[PDB]
Amino acid sequence: FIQMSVQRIVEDAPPIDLQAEAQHASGEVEEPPRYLLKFEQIYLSKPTHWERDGAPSPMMPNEARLRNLTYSAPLYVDITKTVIKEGEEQLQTQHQKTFIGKIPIMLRSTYCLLNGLTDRDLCELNECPLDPGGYFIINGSEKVLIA
Amino acid sequence: TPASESSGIVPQLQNIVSTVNLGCKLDLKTIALRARNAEYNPKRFAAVIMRIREPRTTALIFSSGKMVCTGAKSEEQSRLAARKYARVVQKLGFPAKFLDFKIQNMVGSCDVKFPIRLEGLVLTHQQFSSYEPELFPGLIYRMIKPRIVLLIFVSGKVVLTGAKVRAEIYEAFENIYPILKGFRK
Amino acid sequence: TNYKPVANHQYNIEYERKKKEDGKRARADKQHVLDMLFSAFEKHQYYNLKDLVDITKQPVVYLKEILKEIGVQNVKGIHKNTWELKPE
Amino acid sequence: MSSSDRAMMNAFKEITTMADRINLPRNIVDRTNNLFKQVYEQKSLKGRANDAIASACLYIACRQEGVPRTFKEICAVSRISKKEIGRCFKLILKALETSVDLITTGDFMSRFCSNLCLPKQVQMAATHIARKAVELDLVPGRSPISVAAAAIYMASQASAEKRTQKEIGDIAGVADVTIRQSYRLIYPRAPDLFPTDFKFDTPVDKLPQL
Amino acid sequence: TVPKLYRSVIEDVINDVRDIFLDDGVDEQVLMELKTLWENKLMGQVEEEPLNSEDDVSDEEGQELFDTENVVVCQYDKIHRSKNKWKFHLKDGIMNLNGRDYIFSKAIGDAEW
Amino acid sequence: LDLAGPLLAFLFRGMFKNLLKEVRIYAQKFIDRGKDFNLELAIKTRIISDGLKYSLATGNWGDQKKAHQARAGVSQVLNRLTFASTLSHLRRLNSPIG
Amino acid sequence: FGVLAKIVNYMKTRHQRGDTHPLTLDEILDETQHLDIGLKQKQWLMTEALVNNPKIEVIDGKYAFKPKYNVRDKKALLRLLDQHDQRGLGGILLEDIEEALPNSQKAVKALGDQILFVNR
Amino acid sequence: MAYQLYRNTTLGNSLQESLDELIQSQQITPQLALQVLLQFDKAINAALAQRVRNRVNFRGSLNTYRFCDNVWTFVLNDVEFREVTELIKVDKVKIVACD
Description:
The structure is cut from a larger assembly and holds eight protein chains of seven kinds. Chain C is an alpha+beta fold.
């Protein structure tokens, strides 16, 4: 879902274009201005949290429990801005790489970087090796989806 | 006993702003046309801007007949220019007058010749003193005694304005200099 | 993270355009606007006030003074303050 | 419901939508909501744009939390000119009759060095360099952020994590010449400004000049 | 080279109106007379009312009309002033100095008043 | 059997439609002024973000302002009485109860 | 329509300005320096426009007012106004100014004499 | 908008005088003189935008000035037009600057 499905929706129909009003009679207006928006790959940061100083830090799921924070990661996207503009300057393109959100991640996910760590690593993290997770942590509370 | 423990670095007045009514309505277009050293553009402002090299002043001629004199180093010079301005306008063919002349603003400046700790100053007189290094390098002191505003800079330079009386600059400065000396770095 | 531009860019872009010209224009001895009125009303009997404002370069209140002077107005069955030249 | 509150009601959505863009703690936002409510209740400044007031409330709350964010930053999340925010800011200080605090360089050492992913030792070294410089008033002119960035630059130039002024300048937003000037002001004391607990990657003698 | 350019314009303007001359039914020799004639042409107070108590700071306006000044006509690109220091940015200009004729595409200036 | 991925994508699809329209509302504001475009200013990330916070926290399923009634209690807090109890919680199955 | 509205307005204007005497189309063209409107238009204006006007007054060879037919009576419209049997048709404030002079100075004296005003 | 002002020059006037002669001799109609003058206007505007390329620098104290209808009219004194070969100092110059 993270790997493709959200992306398929991003693959689906995000491109939109908009054309300004003609505002008829603005002499030799020529024709009304026009703007188009384009999107590419969607990006995801590892689970992290921004401390009141505005600075980022790693989101330890153990930390998520203690500070009662919601286990989540930043979601990022390739964005493009695109316009013939219905003027002489057609095909002029402008690139963006934009923060779109913080996605709550399932424990033991591929993005749950602890998934590679040994039990010994996990105990080094004070994590339980027989605690596979598979459920989100929301506001420090454990949450499981029922089928 | 002196009035202050520090006293002087006489604060010199640098600018005066005055206004006067010519007592009649005028046609600035005609004025602009006639004048040899004035500017006008209704698309920019409704008044004629006239200048004279005399004391390098500038006048603002409203269609209402009101005028503003600027650039003058003294109230008299402002009065002199404004009077000098009023005459010429009359000399254009208009019933100009010198009705209701008054001073609108005076500007002074001086240097205390020593640096001061603004941090302490903005702290101790936050009620009146005001400063923000992210905003403007000069500290703004709004005195109410004689309702004067001061501008205080890290180099020790000071500017005073909003005055309609020259003594108030001297007075506002007489009150603030000792305090500043007490804030020497 | 995205740079803070101390002032809104588009607003700033707006500023270069804004400084070029103002809508605060002059209006002495009404005449050029009525002549233009004959030109517009020759195409249709009645027009919307905003559209009347578009041909003009003067305040609507002043414009209101003109449209009252040679015409009246309607709702035209569309509420809109639509103006037309006096049939009489 | 009260058409009257609807711009205020929308302003707090816009406050929330303004706090959203940079992941601000809710306690700050709440005081901000309370600040606006207070400013609204005065109505003396009803002749002002709500979004500027919201943005000014925001600048104040950060200072009220002892962690100011630059207007430049505050501008990033709003349409309001820094001038109008400053103007509105003054009006609010006068409106709510409350004092403020002076800025410190170290409060921005954290995120910028973070944005450069600089290790705490460099980050902390910069802070001392900055701290020592201001105590000595080595730079009685340049903005403390400009002074801080050059210290950071000096620090980064004292570690393997060197960066070009333009990149730093780009992160701080200040002019690359302003750092260059601020650097010229701190450079005479580059060696002695460093903390006693430091490990050079480049000799102070070998510190570049610009 | 500059006088040549002036000719180019002379040739271009005359030729480009030729057809108009025809439309009037006017003979092209008359057009040549036009060019020929043309080329040959080429070469204190104590009351709010007694304002007159301040008479004469203005100078004589007749300084401005005797063709003592050579003439210049041009569009302006930018005008600047600083109290007494003026700045001028001009373009596309026609100059007539000491009876001579000149032209320019861009002009930048400075002046005090 | 309904799982998180197709379900999340539905909210993702719906909020994106909400997000696309909200940015378009700015695009309407953009044409309204005719002043240059700002992409970052139109952004309202929290809407989806906070929207998801509701679905995920309560277990509820919708925009709460409208559709949600037929999909209450999708999601619940994990049980930690025993590890086996936990594992049972992780593997439990439910139905629309007809 | 516009030209006719322009003709009416000028005629109104010049009359207010001081020319309280009947005019002609040609005289208007002449005075407005618009004589070169074309004989066809000139003619069409003279013998159709100033014919389709429902209130234009033919004095003889000169067109007169349609808006205010009354003379420069200025003050006192009491005889007409008093007629309560028909309310008095009274006069409109616009009509009164058109008649000769601004209403206000006359009105101030009139308010204590014989006239009462409603804002309707 | 076309600048009629450039007809009020030696170039423009020598044309108009020659044309007026053609009108006095009735070799042309007045209407013909107008179209040719109109064409000359269009033609001289074009030549400015095209054939003209040279730029000049100037210096001179301001003597008098005026501004109306987006057109400035100055008269400067002790002026100096600067060019690498045709340096020209002048006691006074009148400057008209249309928008």
